[PDB]
Amino acid sequence: AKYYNEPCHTFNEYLLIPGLSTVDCIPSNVNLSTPLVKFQKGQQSEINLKIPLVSAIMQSVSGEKMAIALAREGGISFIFGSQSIESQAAMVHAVKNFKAHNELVDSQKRYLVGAGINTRDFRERVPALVEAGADVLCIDSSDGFSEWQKITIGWIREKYGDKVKVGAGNIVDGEGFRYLADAGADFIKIGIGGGSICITREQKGIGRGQATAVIDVVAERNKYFEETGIYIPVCSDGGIVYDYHMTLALAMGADFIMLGRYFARFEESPTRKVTINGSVMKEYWGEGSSRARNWSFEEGVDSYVPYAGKLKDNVEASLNKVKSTMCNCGALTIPQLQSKAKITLVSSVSI
Amino acid sequence: AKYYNEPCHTFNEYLLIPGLSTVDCIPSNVNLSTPLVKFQKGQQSEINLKIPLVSAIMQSVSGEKMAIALAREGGISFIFGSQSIESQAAMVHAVKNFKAHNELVDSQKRYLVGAGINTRDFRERVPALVEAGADVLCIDSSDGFSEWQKITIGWIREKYGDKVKVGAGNIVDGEGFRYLADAGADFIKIGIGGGSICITREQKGIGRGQATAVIDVVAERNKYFEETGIYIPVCSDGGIVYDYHMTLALAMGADFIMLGRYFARFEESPTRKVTINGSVMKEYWGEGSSRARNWSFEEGVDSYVPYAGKLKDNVEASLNKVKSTMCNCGALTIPQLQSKAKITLVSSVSI
Amino acid sequence: AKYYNEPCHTFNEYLLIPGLSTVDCIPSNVNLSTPLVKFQKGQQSEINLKIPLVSAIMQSVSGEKMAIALAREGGISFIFGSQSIESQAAMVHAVKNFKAHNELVDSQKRYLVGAGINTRDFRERVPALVEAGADVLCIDSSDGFSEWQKITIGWIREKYGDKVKVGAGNIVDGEGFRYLADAGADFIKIGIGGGSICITREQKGIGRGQATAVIDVVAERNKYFEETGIYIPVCSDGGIVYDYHMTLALAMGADFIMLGRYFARFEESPTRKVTINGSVMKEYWGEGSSRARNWSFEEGVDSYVPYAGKLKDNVEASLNKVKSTMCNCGALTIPQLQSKAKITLVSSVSI
Amino acid sequence: AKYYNEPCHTFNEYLLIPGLSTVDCIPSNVNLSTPLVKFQKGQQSEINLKIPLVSAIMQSVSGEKMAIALAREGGISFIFGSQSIESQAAMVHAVKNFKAHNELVDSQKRYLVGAGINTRDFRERVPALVEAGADVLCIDSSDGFSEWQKITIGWIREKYGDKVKVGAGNIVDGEGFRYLADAGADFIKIGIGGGSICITREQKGIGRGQATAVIDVVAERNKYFEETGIYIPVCSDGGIVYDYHMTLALAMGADFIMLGRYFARFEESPTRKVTINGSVMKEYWGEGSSRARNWSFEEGVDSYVPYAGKLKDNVEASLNKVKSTMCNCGALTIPQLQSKAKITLVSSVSI
Ligand SMILES: O=c1[nH]c(=O)c2[nH+]cn([C@@H]3O[C@H](COP(=O)(O)O)[C@@H](O)[C@H]3O)c2[nH]1
Ligand SMILES: O=c1[nH]c(=O)c2[nH+]cn([C@@H]3O[C@H](COP(=O)(O)O)[C@@H](O)[C@H]3O)c2[nH]1
Ligand SMILES: O=c1[nH]c(=O)c2[nH+]cn([C@@H]3O[C@H](COP(=O)(O)O)[C@@H](O)[C@H]3O)c2[nH]1
Ligand SMILES: O=c1[nH]c(=O)c2[nH+]cn([C@@H]3O[C@H](COP(=O)(O)O)[C@@H](O)[C@H]3O)c2[nH]1
Ligand SMILES: COc1c(C)c2c(c(O)c1C/C=C(\C)CCC(=O)O)C(=O)OC2
Ligand SMILES: COc1c(C)c2c(c(O)c1C/C=C(\C)CCC(=O)O)C(=O)OC2
Ligand SMILES: COc1c(C)c2c(c(O)c1C/C=C(\C)CCC(=O)O)C(=O)OC2
Ligand SMILES: COc1c(C)c2c(c(O)c1C/C=C(\C)CCC(=O)O)C(=O)OC2
Ligand SMILES: [K+]
Ligand SMILES: [K+]
Ligand SMILES: [K+]
Ligand SMILES: [K+]
């Protein structure tokens, strides 16, 4: 077997050490744009988010309303694919034709929207998604280091060339990243086990601390860029517990962040608002729970998250803190933060 | 005194990082066969389990019914030796003559069965066990790094040659493994302290994290194979808390796993089913407890484990998860898993 | 991004190993004097505290009474600047003209007093503070690694030369220290996150274990002294939970210590004494709390600390323990302690 | 300041890895003798304990009855010196003249007994102790790395030469050991902070994990023996929580062990037996508590320990476990254990 010199770590084990803050760095001047899909050196990505946040490919998170609400703030949602092909297409179509600011839109002023796909019914699902107007796709899986993802991406490239963007994952190391990059992925998703509704131990026992995973994949991605001139955006998916974890994920090299629990709390998530002993909550279940697969064990859990109100106010408060921290680190942009951030590990006792 | 460069670790401190999963790797195609006794290079073991699980040499675990139930699924039980020689022989005989699938049987279609022996009355116990039809024996001890085990194995070899298979242990490092290998053991059992009914601290203070023990013994075993051409199967005994710990133990090099608590929960264990406030439990006590030795201190404990029903359904669910994880690691067989597994240590905080 | 070879640590992770205690080292002979502002090699500081303790630049800690009570024992208070310029000046003036022992006074026998200032209204606030008689100033900020502090210090030097002393901070590493030193700071304050009313995680996620911060800044400060002949006193601000943490902070190189919670408990702090179910408490809130800024988030908290009585008796008990420990380390003075202290890290388990 | 490459550890962080157990190693054949005072190479110590246990120099532990009860089993007690010179002498005299097995006696068949002394009234106390018949003395202090201990030992050597044996301490590193060795100590006591009634943190903040302290002092002691031919026995004082900690302390190099709490639980300790809600307890307070010094702070605590009955049965049970573990390590004697023990550190998570 193969072992490692250091144990893996989660975002909670890190802190940012301030850098020189210049007079021109104020939150309002911080630019949170970031690339969504791959491009060659000297070019810009064909799709740039206004904010580095995307909602998870989950039944309890990314519905029609979530996609519109998030696109309006500059991010993008990946409509869950764990439903009928026609149901998913309808949601995508409803978002693209909603208008029939930092809004994320296409050349027709229509909100951008993503859609999750699987390695099984993609021959029928992809065409429907494209026809419906999906701006980008993403293969949704707990272990993307699979020949099935290579086959899926390959089929897409053979029928649509580079006109259809498709993200792949999830992986947690340089090898997995490399495999999906050579396969043609437009962006690679990082993370196995970090999620909130994730009980890694009581499951398969596969995974890696999110911080270690991002740091390792980012180094491979940068190495890959130097060898081929191809820059592949990476997404840190899961493991975000506090707002500052967002800044950490970006500082470590992630171009954008995928969140489930965070967005599930909003009015715009597709779940039921439930009042439990004076507290308003929202339903939240993992895609691995039996509650979701049904569309003696269980890959995820079914629980509740506290109601936080509308997405807008919460995302604004979260990103204001990110912007402020970025200025503490001497960064006016995400690339500058990734370049200048001073990140330290914290001792067990400190926690 | 002699010290080590690194502290020891338990299975809970590790996670598996996925490898390339090929299209041909599906749980149903995973082969869980594994060697039970030693063989020379170029040969196959004379006894191969269909599944890498064996039930512990304990009064509260391996009785007649357990041995039959486990053999039927492909594993083997070691009838406890902490009873009269005639009582143990009767159980062994009852298993071998029960018939008077992935079943583990001999050339006569009879279920395979093991039997534990001690370093004291082996001159009278072994013959009775052999005569009764025991397929394999195993010296049961908390510290197998003993001249007594060498003497016991030697006596067996002098009277039966290599016709009678005998496992030895337990040990936790390369030196202990080496001593038992040169002594002639057919398989060596790893583990001191890991057990569930083990309170190492409040005992002698001897032991080692199970993961570190297995990793160290496996390296010595591989070194031993290269020097002599003799492959000695090793057994990871104790310390298995979750199903994924099984995959970890195998990935680290253990050929098979010995479990006590896990099997004690089944209908087939020889203990009393007790209902405590709406919960059906099963009795479980260590071989070191006064409750067992009686056949001011105490080497083990006497407690309860939750009833899990029949062995079949539980073992199947456990091994399906192992098989699935193996495919995540790109392995269709145990040897392939031991060769390809990527194993990472996890930080204290992560736990 | 930039990473570090070791994780950061807090004061609770360290212990002092005794050195040779000579017959002449008794608590009563221990000298606790220490420099407040910078000086050149071969010289002495223009201001030396009699005891290495200063009260925090906070509304709930450093008022008129605190400043008088602390100066009387040999330390100094920094009147909080989070109030009107005229209100702060009045407090400073009241302290300087209170008389209209180990007392800390100027050549006119008047108690010494400090005053906090900010990087915004300093052009109007400084003159008022100087005119009122403030002996030393200090820029109060969560991240002193800022061009704004450079600008503020520069303005002071252009209008008052080296006649007005001004401390800067807070910083946590050699780079931050270096930036403020070159900027002209008379003393540099260390610490971000350590404070008691600090919830670093649920904030920006910036900071560093106080011990690691002090050790790193002290090494840079000593390096700076060797290169330029300028000795800049450093202050360990926050993170002091127990009396022995004081000895640790000094042993690690800090010239003096800034405390908030510690002093808030005294009769002389400007907050309300509140009786909660038989326990007399004192109010205490951070400068980052909304309760203080008002002069959807929050940089600090608003809580209670147990009443400890008058400052005198408590400070005396605290420093007697420091003096005693110093003798255990073979030190009669702070510089001798910084030179001879043997400091060991403690394992996680030990805690 | 001076730092260390590794953090310190306590006994709870270690486990013993078994060695080869030979047929001749059975508990009954294990020899637990050990040297009490220093000797030259090629010689034997003038005083050898039959068992490596000595009771602490405390008011709540070592009285007349304890000294007799322990000597009868082969150990020795150090009558507490925190009492009048005439009271301590009376106890010593009562023990030496009690008779007016593994018993520890002098050439006159009288029980051996020790007596604690301090660095202040030794000119009057020592003579009284010698005259009373004390077999060995020991300077009792929280920090023995003091010129006062050198002066005390020197005075004893000037008036009695090498006829009066005197132990010194406590120290926790090679430097402290070395200082007391050159000063003439007959044995050196290790340990600061480890004790049960020790709240190191809420005190001076001086100390070191007991295991690290013993390991470091033992290496210095062995180095000292090689340079001078003088073997100085060392005592691991405090930090013993479980029986196996005894085996660890010895394996690490300590010749004998000093215990307070352990012995306080016995019928023979000089404290009151108190029944608290069905549980019989014994009083136990540290020598640093105000309750003891009286013969605003506090170096120790005043609590209760569970009644364990007579010393005999408990010590026998404890040492049987030590002997058994020694055989697991292939040792028939303490020196053999110190030479052959395989000691591993355990991970934080394991605990
Ligand atoms: O262990 C898991 N069991 C599940 O059932 C599950 N469903 C989703 N996911 C993954 O978790 C991410 C969302 O995580 P958060 O709620 O932490 O933001 C998502 O983006 C996915 O990567 C799961 N992980
Ligand atoms: O500390 C111990 N005290 C005992 O009384 C005891 N009895 C058995 N064993 C050992 O534990 C293994 C079973 O462990 P699990 O229940 O964890 O599977 C078994 O296979 C044995 O190796 C003991 N260990
Ligand atoms: O996280 C924080 N939120 C706040 O609201 C706050 N107010 C003050 N400070 C800083 O804490 C120091 C006082 O700390 P102690 O109470 O621990 O002595 C002070 O000296 C400051 O450095 C804050 N830190
Ligand atoms: O922190 C302390 N405060 C006290 O008041 C105290 N009194 C004794 N000792 C020391 O502790 C040893 C006994 O420890 P145990 O009870 O752990 O065996 C003793 O042998 C001493 O080394 C003290 N340590
Ligand atoms: C697919 O959604 C996920 C993702 C992205 C992740 C995990 C996970 O459990 C699920 C749900 C698991 C499902 C629906 C079962 C199918 C499968 O195995 O892919 C995880 O642990 O890391 C990432
Ligand atoms: C023999 O069964 C075991 C085994 C295999 C192990 C342990 C143990 O305590 C017992 C019971 C201990 C008994 C019956 C006392 C005799 C003896 O000492 O052998 C353990 O700690 O690691 C492995
Ligand atoms: C200024 O007082 C502090 C100091 C010294 C520190 C911290 C802090 O939160 C505050 C309050 C934060 C305020 C008033 C908001 C303005 C700002 O950001 O400066 C901290 O974390 O380390 C040091
Ligand atoms: C003297 O008995 C001890 C010993 C041996 C130790 C400690 C201790 O606190 C006391 C009591 C402390 C007293 C009586 C105050 C006088 C002094 O300081 O010596 C400890 O921490 O390590 C070892
Ligand atoms: K900054
Ligand atoms: K895979
Ligand atoms: K000393
Ligand atoms: K052994």
Short mmCIF file of N, CA, C and O in Angstrom, two decimals, chain A residues 252-300:
data_model
loop_
_atom_site.label_atom_id
_atom_site.label_comp_id
_atom_site.label_asym_id
_atom_site.label_seq_id
_atom_site.Cartn_x
_atom_site.Cartn_y
_atom_site.Cartn_z
N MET A 252 -6.33 28.84 -0.46
CA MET A 252 -5.59 27.62 -0.74
C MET A 252 -5.54 27.28 -2.24
O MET A 252 -4.83 26.38 -2.64
N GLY A 253 -6.29 28.02 -3.06
CA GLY A 253 -6.25 27.77 -4.49
C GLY A 253 -7.56 27.41 -5.19
O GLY A 253 -7.61 27.39 -6.42
N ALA A 254 -8.61 27.12 -4.43
CA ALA A 254 -9.88 26.79 -5.05
C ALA A 254 -10.41 28.04 -5.75
O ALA A 254 -10.38 29.14 -5.19
N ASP A 255 -10.89 27.88 -6.98
CA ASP A 255 -11.42 29.00 -7.75
C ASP A 255 -12.82 29.35 -7.25
O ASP A 255 -13.17 30.52 -7.15
N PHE A 256 -13.62 28.33 -6.95
CA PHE A 256 -14.95 28.57 -6.41
C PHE A 256 -15.31 27.49 -5.39
O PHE A 256 -14.60 26.50 -5.23
N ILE A 257 -16.42 27.71 -4.69
CA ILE A 257 -16.86 26.82 -3.63
C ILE A 257 -18.28 26.30 -3.83
O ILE A 257 -19.17 27.06 -4.21
N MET A 258 -18.49 25.00 -3.59
CA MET A 258 -19.83 24.43 -3.71
C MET A 258 -20.35 24.18 -2.30
O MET A 258 -19.67 23.57 -1.48
N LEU A 259 -21.56 24.64 -2.02
CA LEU A 259 -22.16 24.49 -0.71
C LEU A 259 -23.56 23.91 -0.76
O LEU A 259 -24.34 24.22 -1.66
N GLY A 260 -23.87 23.06 0.21
CA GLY A 260 -25.19 22.46 0.28
C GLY A 260 -25.95 23.04 1.46
O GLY A 260 -26.87 23.83 1.30
N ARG A 261 -25.53 22.65 2.66
CA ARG A 261 -26.15 23.10 3.91
C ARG A 261 -26.36 24.62 3.95
O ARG A 261 -27.44 25.10 4.30
N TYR A 262 -25.31 25.37 3.61
CA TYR A 262 -25.34 26.83 3.60
C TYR A 262 -26.57 27.39 2.87
O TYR A 262 -27.28 28.25 3.40
N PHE A 263 -26.82 26.90 1.66
CA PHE A 263 -27.95 27.36 0.85
C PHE A 263 -29.30 26.74 1.22
O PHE A 263 -30.34 27.34 0.98
N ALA A 264 -29.28 25.54 1.79
CA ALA A 264 -30.50 24.85 2.18
C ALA A 264 -31.30 25.65 3.21
O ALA A 264 -32.53 25.54 3.28
N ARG A 265 -30.60 26.46 4.00
CA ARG A 265 -31.21 27.29 5.04
C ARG A 265 -32.05 28.44 4.50
O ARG A 265 -32.86 29.01 5.23
N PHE A 266 -31.85 28.79 3.24
CA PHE A 266 -32.57 29.91 2.66
C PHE A 266 -34.01 29.64 2.21
O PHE A 266 -34.39 28.51 1.90
N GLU A 267 -34.79 30.71 2.20
CA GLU A 267 -36.18 30.68 1.79
C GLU A 267 -36.30 30.05 0.41
O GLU A 267 -37.24 29.31 0.13
N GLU A 268 -35.33 30.34 -0.46
CA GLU A 268 -35.34 29.83 -1.82
C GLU A 268 -35.02 28.35 -2.04
O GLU A 268 -35.15 27.86 -3.15
N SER A 269 -34.59 27.63 -1.00
CA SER A 269 -34.31 26.21 -1.18
C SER A 269 -35.67 25.53 -1.36
O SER A 269 -36.67 25.98 -0.78
N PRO A 270 -35.73 24.44 -2.14
CA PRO A 270 -36.96 23.70 -2.42
C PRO A 270 -37.56 22.82 -1.33
O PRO A 270 -38.47 22.03 -1.60
N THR A 271 -37.08 22.94 -0.10
CA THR A 271 -37.60 22.10 0.97
C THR A 271 -38.65 22.78 1.84
O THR A 271 -38.89 23.98 1.75
N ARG A 272 -39.28 21.98 2.70
CA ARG A 272 -40.32 22.46 3.60
C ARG A 272 -39.77 23.22 4.79
O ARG A 272 -38.77 22.82 5.40
N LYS A 273 -40.42 24.33 5.10
CA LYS A 273 -40.04 25.16 6.23
C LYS A 273 -40.83 24.56 7.39
O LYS A 273 -42.05 24.51 7.35
N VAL A 274 -40.13 24.07 8.41
CA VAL A 274 -40.78 23.44 9.55
C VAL A 274 -40.50 24.13 10.88
O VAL A 274 -39.35 24.42 11.20
N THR A 275 -41.55 24.36 11.65
CA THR A 275 -41.41 25.00 12.96
C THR A 275 -41.33 23.97 14.07
O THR A 275 -42.30 23.26 14.34
N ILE A 276 -40.17 23.88 14.70
CA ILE A 276 -39.94 22.94 15.79
C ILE A 276 -39.70 23.70 17.09
O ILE A 276 -38.67 24.36 17.25
N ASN A 277 -40.65 23.60 18.01
CA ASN A 277 -40.59 24.27 19.31
C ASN A 277 -40.06 25.71 19.24
O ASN A 277 -39.04 26.04 19.84
N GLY A 278 -40.77 26.56 18.50
CA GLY A 278 -40.38 27.95 18.39
C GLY A 278 -39.28 28.27 17.39
O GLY A 278 -39.00 29.44 17.13
N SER A 279 -38.64 27.24 16.85
CA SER A 279 -37.56 27.45 15.88
C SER A 279 -37.96 27.02 14.48
O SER A 279 -38.37 25.88 14.27
N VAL A 280 -37.83 27.93 13.53
CA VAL A 280 -38.16 27.62 12.15
C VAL A 280 -36.93 26.97 11.51
O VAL A 280 -35.83 27.53 11.54
N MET A 281 -37.13 25.78 10.96
CA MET A 281 -36.05 25.02 10.33
C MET A 281 -36.39 24.68 8.89
O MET A 281 -37.51 24.90 8.42
N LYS A 282 -35.40 24.13 8.18
CA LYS A 282 -35.60 23.70 6.81
C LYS A 282 -35.07 22.28 6.71
O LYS A 282 -34.11 21.91 7.39
N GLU A 283 -35.71 21.48 5.87
CA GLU A 283 -35.28 20.11 5.70
C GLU A 283 -34.00 20.07 4.89
O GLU A 283 -33.77 20.92 4.02
N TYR A 284 -33.18 19.08 5.17
CA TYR A 284 -31.92 18.92 4.46
C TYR A 284 -31.50 17.47 4.54
O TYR A 284 -31.36 16.91 5.62
N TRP A 285 -31.31 16.85 3.38
CA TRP A 285 -30.89 15.46 3.34
C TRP A 285 -29.86 15.29 2.24
O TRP A 285 -29.89 16.00 1.23
N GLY A 286 -28.93 14.36 2.46
CA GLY A 286 -27.89 14.11 1.48
C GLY A 286 -28.41 13.31 0.29
O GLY A 286 -29.45 12.66 0.38
N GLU A 287 -27.69 13.37 -0.82
CA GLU A 287 -28.08 12.65 -2.02
C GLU A 287 -27.86 11.15 -1.82
O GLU A 287 -28.37 10.33 -2.58
N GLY A 288 -27.10 10.81 -0.78
CA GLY A 288 -26.83 9.41 -0.50
C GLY A 288 -27.85 8.77 0.43
O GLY A 288 -27.85 7.56 0.61
N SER A 289 -28.71 9.58 1.03
CA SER A 289 -29.73 9.05 1.93
C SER A 289 -30.77 8.29 1.11
O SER A 289 -30.94 8.54 -0.09
N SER A 290 -31.46 7.36 1.75
CA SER A 290 -32.48 6.57 1.07
C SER A 290 -33.61 7.49 0.64
O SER A 290 -34.29 7.23 -0.36
N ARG A 291 -33.80 8.58 1.38
CA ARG A 291 -34.85 9.55 1.07
C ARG A 291 -34.67 10.18 -0.31
O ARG A 291 -35.64 10.62 -0.93
N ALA A 292 -33.43 10.21 -0.80
CA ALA A 292 -33.13 10.80 -2.10
C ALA A 292 -32.98 9.78 -3.23
O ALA A 292 -33.45 10.02 -4.35
N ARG A 293 -32.32 8.67 -2.94
CA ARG A 293 -32.11 7.62 -3.93
C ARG A 293 -33.42 7.04 -4.45
O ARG A 293 -33.51 6.57 -5.58
N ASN A 294 -34.45 7.09 -3.60
CA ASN A 294 -35.76 6.57 -3.95
C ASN A 294 -36.52 7.50 -4.91
O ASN A 294 -37.61 7.97 -4.58
N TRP A 295 -35.95 7.75 -6.08
CA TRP A 295 -36.60 8.61 -7.08
C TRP A 295 -36.87 7.83 -8.36
O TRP A 295 -37.50 8.35 -9.28
N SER A 296 -30.46 -1.37 3.56
CA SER A 296 -30.17 -1.61 4.97
C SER A 296 -29.05 -0.69 5.46
O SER A 296 -28.60 -0.81 6.61
N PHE A 297 -28.61 0.21 4.60
CA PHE A 297 -27.55 1.15 4.95
C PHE A 297 -27.93 2.54 4.46
O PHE A 297 -29.09 2.77 4.09
N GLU A 298 -26.98 3.47 4.45
CA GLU A 298 -27.25 4.83 3.99
C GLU A 298 -25.98 5.68 3.94
O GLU A 298 -25.26 5.81 4.93
N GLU A 299 -25.73 6.28 2.78
CA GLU A 299 -24.54 7.11 2.56
C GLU A 299 -24.65 8.52 3.12
O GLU A 299 -23.65 9.23 3.24
N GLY A 300 -25.87 8.94 3.45
CA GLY A 300 -26.06 10.28 3.98
C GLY A 300 -27.10 10.32 5.08
O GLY A 300 -27.61 9.28 5.50
#
